[PDB]
């Protein structure tokens, strides 16, 4: 509904690069997107750490359902809202190991991982969206992407050097 990005045949990606000396490291994070697709299997938005670091965030599709998996340094834990081609908004937030997710006005789903665990998504490097290089490029519509006070797609519309577009993509207007 908002700033709409369309992934055409095969799809593509907008790639946003953090400056080497300004890469952040946050215990808690906020994620929010509005998609419109009917894919039964795909990966929507992946965000991995720098080289040599296994902390990473993935928000994907499995059997048409929207699941999110992630690791902060110890292991993987996944939560899913157990897509119809319309502008459905999904908000994903975390605080260290604590993880919560919700789609539109549906009841919130939250996880409380057990045991001592790391609590920082150490040294993020870049943001991947659409799964162009994950083997599951996304083909649909994405509006209102958001990340802990950084809506990259809006910066993508601003034509910034840190950001780079690649693959099959179309913009409204």
């Amino acid at each position: 509904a908002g700033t709409t990005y369309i992934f055409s045949k095969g799809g593509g990606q907008i790639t946003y690069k953090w400056p080497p000396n300004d890469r952040p490291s946050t215990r808690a994070d906020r994620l929010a997107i509005g998609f419109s697709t009917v894919q039964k299997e795909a990966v929507l938005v992946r965000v991995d750490s720098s080289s040599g670091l296994g902390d990473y965030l993935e928000l994907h599709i499995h059997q048409g359902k929207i699941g999110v998996k992630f690791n902060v340094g110890t292991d993987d834990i996944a939560i899913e809202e157990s897509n119809d081609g319309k502008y459905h908004v999904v908000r994903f937030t975390r605080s260290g190991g604590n993880a919560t997710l919700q789609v539109d006005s549906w009841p919130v789903i939250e996880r409380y991982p057990a045991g001592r665990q790391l609590t920082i998504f150490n040294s993020q490097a870049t943001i991947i969206i659409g799964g162009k290089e994950q083997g599951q490029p996304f083909q649909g519509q994405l509006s209102g992407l958001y990340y802990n006070g950084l809506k990259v797609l809006n910066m993508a519309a601003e034509n910034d050097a840190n950001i780079a577009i690649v693959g099959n993509v179309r913009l409204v207007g």
């Binding site: 080497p20 000396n21 001592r116 609590t119 150490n122 040294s123």
Partner: protein
């Protein structure tokens, strides 16, 4: 105004407009004894700090606030205290003369020339130190930056814990954290940028700053940090047996109640002055009272947190003086000859037992280390064996732990410039064969030489030294603004040895570091041979 006034969220304060004795730097608007927390006098004792109640009118904040409780005529740990601190002991006592339980106050040194913010942590030990000792004016007069000094709970009053909810201890850090929060919401009124807050400590304070870097509570209260001479993992950095030391403390006090909470109440009902005067003697190279693994401040041992990389990538400066355990070489410090063979082993044997106390593997370490720190070119000389003994200790407590800090941090893509100090000022008490010692850099950071010889550091300095003193602060302030000690202000005399020098980062693979001194140069691996022995080999000999 020569007697300016300023406003804060808690009211208004009156400061001074002192003029420094130099003729190159401008005026500084100082502030003395600014409150930042409720004085924990009554039941508040051994409770987390609370922000102070706002005052009406204008507060006369132009006098040095009272020092926090601490004893000088006692068995203080001389091993970890800065050398100058023990030398001119009575001079230090002069500064700590108004001990009062309402010690939570902080100062400022606003210069005239948004201003960058530099905050300081003091403390040679964890049971000693009053911020007033250091005159922050000069630095603020040279870097056009905000210098802040603060007091916090010390000794038993700050780090008393049973390990349970009745007593968590670690209060001092909380007080420092609170002040940072205070500086977060106040400094802008004085003209200092809240987004460029930097913390630099030394010795025991150096241990504090790292704890903050690992703190959960300190998530966004600064951006940069400095450290020096002991980072996080020294034998004395963190206590682990608080319960054992508390029990005897209360026993010597008298009310050694079986339950901690009952013990907590009795102490809360006992005068503060009595607590300080009471004597507690911890095992050598260990701290009776100090920060402990709790869960709310430090979730786990710093090594564990550091290994997995638990921190929000604050740029760091870490350094160590060449020879720092001067006080550790004490008995033979005043011998015309060196350390004898009969006395050399004994030193090592005692050292190994105290730290690596273990009956299973003792001699293997005892023999191996014995050989390692002995230049066989002059095996029987004796005199040079003293230096290595000094080199032995300093390597273990400061160099190696600091190196481990840098590598681990660098491994997680965090800007870190390692440094090292070799120059020193001729001190009457210090021996000729000594070198830049633990605490022979704080004056340079504060630029005391610019002012000249003072009560704390009567040893005068040469013009050459003065030139360097400017160099270091230029580097420090350079970092405070951008982070690259070169970026903002190119170096200058203001010949100059430090003109072409380019200070690189500290990559884990290539351990490039800066060798500050009379002849600054960029080396690649500080004492590579020894450091590896203390981080890779020595762990394996414990099965």
């Amino acid at each position: 105004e020569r007697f300016p006034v300023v406003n804060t969220a808690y009211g208004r304060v009156r400061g001074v407009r002192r003029e420094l004795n130099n003729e190159i730097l401008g005026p500084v608007v100082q502030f003395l004894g600014v409150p930042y927390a409720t004085p924990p006098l009554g039941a508040r004792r051994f409770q987390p700090p609370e922000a102070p109640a706002s005052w009406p009118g204008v507060r006369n904040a132009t006098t040095l606030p009272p020092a926090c409780p601490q004893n000088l005529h006692g068995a203080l740990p001389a091993i970890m205290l800065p050398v100058w601190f023990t030398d001119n002991l009575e001079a230090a006592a002069t500064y700590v003369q108004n001990q009062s339980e309402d010690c939570l106050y902080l100062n400022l040194y606003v210069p005239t020339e948004k201003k960058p913010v530099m905050l300081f942590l003091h403390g040679g030990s964890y049971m000693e130190g009053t911020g007033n000792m250091f005159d922050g004016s000069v630095l603020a007069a040279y870097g056009n930056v905000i210098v802040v000094t603060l007091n916090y709970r010390l000794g038993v009053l700050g780090f008393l814990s049973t390990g349970d909810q009745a007593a968590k201890g670690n209060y001092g850090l909380l007080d420092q954290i609170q002040a940072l929060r205070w500086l977060s919401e106040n400094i802008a009124h004085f003209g200092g940028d809240p987004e460029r807050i930097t913390i630099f400590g030394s010795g025991a304070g150096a241990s504090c700053v790292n704890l903050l870097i690992l703190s959960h509570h300190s998530e966004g209260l600064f951006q940069k940090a400095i450290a020096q001479s002991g980072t996080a993992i020294s034998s004395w950095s963190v206590n682990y047996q608080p319960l054992k030391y508390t029990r005897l403390l209360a026993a010597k006090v008298g009310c050694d109640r079986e339950d901690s909470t009952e013990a907590v109440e009795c102490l809360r009902r006992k005068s503060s002055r009595e607590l300080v005067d009471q004597d507690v003697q911890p095992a050598r190279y260990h701290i009776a009272f100090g920060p402990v693994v709790d869960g709310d401040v430090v979730p786990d041992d710093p090594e564990i947190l550091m290994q997995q990389g638990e921190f929000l990538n604050y740029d760091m400066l870490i350094g160590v003086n060449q020879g720092e355990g001067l006080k550790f070489v004490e008995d033979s410090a005043e011998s015309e000859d060196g350390v004898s063979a009969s006395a050399f082993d004994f030193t090592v044997s005692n050292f190994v037992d105290n730290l690596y106390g273990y009956p299973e593997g003792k001699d293997v370490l005892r023999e191996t280390i014995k050989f390692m720190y002995t230049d066989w070119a002059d095996r029987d000389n004796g005199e040079m064996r003293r230096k290595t003994l000094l080199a032995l200790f300093t390597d273990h407590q400061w160099v190696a732990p600091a190196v481990a800090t840098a590598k681990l941090h660098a491994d997680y893509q965090s800007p870190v410039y390692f440094y090292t100090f070799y120059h020193h000022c001729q001190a009457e008490g210090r021996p000729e064969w000594a070198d830049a010692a633990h605490g022979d850099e704080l004056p340079y950071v504060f630029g005391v030489p610019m002012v000249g010889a003072t009560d704390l550091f009567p040893c005068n300095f040469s013009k050459n030294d003065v030139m360097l003193s400017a160099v270091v602060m230029t580097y420090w302030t350079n970092f405070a603004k951008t982070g690259d000690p070169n970026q903002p202000v190119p170096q200058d005399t203001k010949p100059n040895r430090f003109e072409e020098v380019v200070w690189s980062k500290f990559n884990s693979k290539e351990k490039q570091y800066l060798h500050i001194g009379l002849k600054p140069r960029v080396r690649d691996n500080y004492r590579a041979n020894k450091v590896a022995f203390w981080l890779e080999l020595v762990p394996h000999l414990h099965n």
